[PDB]
Structure 1
Amino acid sequence: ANPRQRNKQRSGKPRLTRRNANKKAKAKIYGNFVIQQNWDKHATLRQNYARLGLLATPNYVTGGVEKLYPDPTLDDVLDKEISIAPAKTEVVRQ
């Protein structure tokens, strides 16, 4: 409708088409190689972090989490020492 868009319609020149429209597509992982090898390109980032035994957020989650299956004193805080934590999965062990 605009005179610029009418101008390029009347022209015999082809349009500068670009094809970048693909939703549902999730960014591929670069950076850590171990994460990339074990990443699942279909699962979401929360599902992948949980499978890899990592934490996607050190804080609370601001909604309901997905449930797929029906599951069945200042002295002793500034001075206590916590001996790390177990590695749940093999990916964390690597």
Structure 2
Amino acid sequence: ANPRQRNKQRSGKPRLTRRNANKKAKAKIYGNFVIQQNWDKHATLRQNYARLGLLATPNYVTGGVEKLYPDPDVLDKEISIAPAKTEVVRQ
């Protein structure tokens, strides 16, 4: 359509192509080597944080979390830590 687009379509120069489209592939993990090693490359970050014993969001989920299977006087007090529910958190 445009003149600039059309003169290089008729010309003999090759088009400055870029095979960049990798749909559906997630961002590979860098940073903490422990979680990278235990990071499933196919699962979503909400699934992988849960599988790894980490909270993706400490704040309320604004939606409907997946159901894969049919699942069956204090200001001075301190919360005595939280035991790790997974080995990887213990790592």
* TM-score, normalized by the shorter chain, greater than 0.5: yes
Q: What percentage of residue pairs aligned between the two structures are identical?
A: 100
**Unmatched tracts of structure 2, length 5 or more:** none
Q: Which runs of 5+ in 1 are unaligned?
A: none
**Cα distance in 2, alignment partners of residues 33 and 65 from structure 1:** 28
Q: How far does residue 17 in structure 1 lie from its aligned partner after superposition?
A: 0.3
Aligned residue in 1 for 2:25: 25
The Cα shift of 1:77 comes to 2.0
CA–CA distance in structure 2, aligned partners of residues 5 and 87 of structure 1: 59
TM-score by length of 2: 0.97
CA distance in 1 between counterparts of 2:25 and 2:65 reads 22
Equivalent residue for 2:85?
88
Q: How much has 1:33 moved relative to structure 2?
A: 0.3
CA shift for structure 1 position 10: 1.3
- TM-score, normalised via structure 1 length: 0.94
Question: What do the CA deviations read for 1:3-53 (whole angstroms, capped 9, x no partner)?
Answer: 001110111100000011111110000000000000001000000000000
Q: Does 1:37 align with 2:34?
A: no
How many residues align? The count is: 91
Offset of 1:78 from its aligned partner? 1.1
Q: Which is helix-richer, 1 or 2?
A: 1
Question: Deviations for 1:43-65, whole angstroms, at most 9, x for unmatched residues?
Answer: 00000000000000011000000
